[PDB]
Amino acid sequence: VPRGSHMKAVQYTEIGSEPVVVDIPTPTPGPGEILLKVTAAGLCHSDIFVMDMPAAQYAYGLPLTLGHEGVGTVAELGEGVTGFGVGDAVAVYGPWGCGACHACARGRENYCTRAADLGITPPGLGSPGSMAEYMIVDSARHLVPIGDLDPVAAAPLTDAGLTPYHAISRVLPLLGPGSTAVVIGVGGLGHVGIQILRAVSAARVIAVDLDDDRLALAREVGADAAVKSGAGAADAIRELTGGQGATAVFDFVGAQSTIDTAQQVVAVDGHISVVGIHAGAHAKVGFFMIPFGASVVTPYWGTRSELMEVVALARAGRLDIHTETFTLDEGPAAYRRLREGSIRGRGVVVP
């Protein structure tokens, strides 16, 4: 469906400004590229992060069509492109890579050692994004078929699904029967994390959050236990495990305090994944500051096969994110709502 010549989009146009709707030219797919008609485009707290970057630290980028969480159908194929038919429902894999280094050749393109130098950026974070009537994707490599899954349900999974899934997959061998996984932060990512831990592992899930509401929600989504986050959370958790320390801690908050709890509750030979972002917050990995053999990493999005697996969980009804639907023209309005945390789960814009 390329028909248009002109298309609607939401762009970040000026540093520190709010995003604005625009009428820009309808792109045309070059050789090797695919042009999608967008069916859903996701908001994310990551989006405010980049728009909150100061003018001092700004080099290049603008204008920028936002939206890294992209779903659509195939509109027009570029030269030489096969492996998709016009109409095929695809999700846009976010973390673009060179395709040619060792990492990309193992599926792990989110860890491409070349994207940096070659200035390969993801859609809606340096490349034209999903929040528009149409979109370009650089390679068929970056399309995952979703069949008849509702695009509104798919969009949030390209991040809120993939991100935690990758975090969990890094250590899924250690999450055998009898293991214990602590999920800190039952917001967007932690919500879907629990659902995941339930599908792919036999581990026992203990949830940690601030809000009382978030605790009972956690139990409903498959957490076997829930404690309140603070100075007391460490003890609270240990109490439950019979003082055994937890196999894996997935910290989807990523605050200093939450990292600190993670360290206090992680098992010997365990693992801590710092998934959420609070600038400056870090784990302190040194002797007698963390159990022996306890590994810590800040992982980053996910691999292609992982996103493929995410969709399978979705299609099998195993994942479910609370989704609230908006309109291209309400784009700015939606981002405003995001800033005030007046959205449960995930805002999704539908051209």
Ligand X SMILES: NC(=O)C1=CN(Cc2ccc(CO)cc2)C=CC1
Q: Are 254 and 278 in contact (CB under 8 A)?
A: yes
44 or 155: whose CB is closer to ligand X? 44
Note the residues at the interface with Zn ion (CB under 5 A): 44, 46, 69, 97-98, 101, 104, 112, 114, 159
CA distance 253 to 251: 5
249 binds, among its own copies, Zn ion, ligand X, none (CB under 5 to 8 A by kind): none
By CB under 8 A, how many residues form the interface with its own copies? Answer: 112
Complex with its own copies: residue 2 or 213, whichever CB lies closer: 213
Q: Out of ligand X, its own copies, Zn ion, none, which partner does residue 228 contact, by CB within 5 to 8 A per kind? A: its own copies
Instruction: Give residues 238-297 in contact with ligand X (rule: CB under 6 A).
Output: 275, 277
Q: What is the footprint of its own copies within residues 183-222 (CB under 8 A)? A: 199-202, 204, 206, 212, 215-216
Q: Please list every residue from 293 through 322 that binds ligand X, using CB under 6 A.
A: 299-301
DSSP track, 210-236: SSHHHHHHHHHHT-SEEEE-STTHHHH
> Cα-flanking dihedrals φ and ψ of residue 230, to 5°?
175, -165
Select the binding partner of residue 341 from Zn ion, its own copies, ligand X, none (C-beta < 5 to 8 A, by kind). Answer: none
Nearer to its own copies, 155 or 313 (CB): 313
Cα angle: 200, vertex 322, 157; to 5 degrees: 50
CB of 195 to its own copies, least distance (A): 11
Question: Does 24 sit near its own copies (CB under 8 A)?
Answer: yes
User: H or E element: which one contains 303?
Assistant: none
Contact map string, positions 51 to 90, toward its own copies, x by CB under 8 A:
-----------xx--------------xxxx-x-------
By CB under 6 A, is residue 155 in contact with ligand X? no
Give CA–CA dist 209/220, Å, rounded.
Answer: 14
* Residues between 88 and 107 that touch its own copies (CB under 8 A): 98-100, 102-103, 105-107
Question: Which of 52, 58, 231, 322 is in the footprint of its own copies by CB under 8 A?
Answer: 231
- Rounded to an integer, what distance in angstroms lies between the CA atom of residue 39 and that of residue 318? 22
Count other C-beta atoms under 10 Å from residue 220's C-beta: 9
169 touches ligand X by CB under 6 A: no
Judged by CB, which is closer to its own copies: 2, or 46? 46
Residue 193 touches which of ligand X, Zn ion, its own copies, none (Cβ within 5-8 Å per kind): none
Question: Please, which residues bridge with residue 324 across strands?
Answer: 347
b (16+ CB within 10 A) / e for 155-172:
bbbbbbbbbbbbbbbbbe
State which residue has the least CB distance to Zn ion. 44
Q: What is the residue-wise DSSP string for 164-196?
A: HHHHHHTTGGG--TT-EEEEE--SHHHHHHHHH
Q: For residues 103 and 109, is the Cβ–Cβ distance under 8 A?
A: yes
Nearer to its own copies, 1 or 84 (CB): 84
Give the position of tokens 């994207």. Answer: 115
